[PDB]
Amino acid sequence: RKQVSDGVAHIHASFNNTIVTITDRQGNALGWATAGGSGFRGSRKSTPFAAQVAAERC
RNA sequence: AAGCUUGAGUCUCGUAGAGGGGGGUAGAAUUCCAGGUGUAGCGGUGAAAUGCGUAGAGAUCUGGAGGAAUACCGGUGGCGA
Numbered sequence: 001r002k003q004v005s006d007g008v009a010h011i012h013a014s015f016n017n018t019i020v021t022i023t024d025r026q027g028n029a030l031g032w033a034t035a036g037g038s039g040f041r042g043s044r045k046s047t048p049f050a051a052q053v054a055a056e057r058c
Numbered sequence: 059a060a061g062c063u064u065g066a067g068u069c070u071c072g073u074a075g076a077g078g079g080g081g082g083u084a085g086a087a088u089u090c091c092a093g094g095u096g097u098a099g100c101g102g103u104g105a106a107a108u109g110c111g112u113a114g115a116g117a118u119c120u121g122g123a124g125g126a127a128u129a130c131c132g133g134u135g136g137c138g139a
Contacts (some may be wrong), residue, residue, distance in 0.1 A: 002074060028095065028119055
């Protein structure tokens with residue numbers, strides 16, 4: 001069995017899109033998602049629910 | 059035609075500063091190169107499409123390549139016709 005027990009999360013929110021990453025302080029991203037990638041476009045790309053399901057999916 | 063030090067000009071030890079060149083010193087990501095991580099949409103708009111996509115477009119790591127450009131400090135602060 002192999003677990004990390006420690007992590008780092010980074011949220012980058014703009015008026016174009018919201019990006020969510022889960023990564024390691026000595027490694028690379030092990031989860032990545034976007035609010036546009038939740039199935040919301042144009043005026044909806046960066047909305048609270050579009051990002052709420054992106055963080056959940058990640 | 060001789061003076062004067064009062065305009066003009068000169069020397070010591072010192073002074074601020076984006077003035078003009080050349081050589082040094084560095085990074086960022088869009089890009090480009092290779093091998094990995096790894097995916098269903100990506101981009102844009104009031105709303106879309108041309109375009110680009112599972113043959114991995116989109117996103118990203120690691121060591122290399124390249125072109126424009128120099129945040130901070132910097133102040134109703136300086137240099138000069």
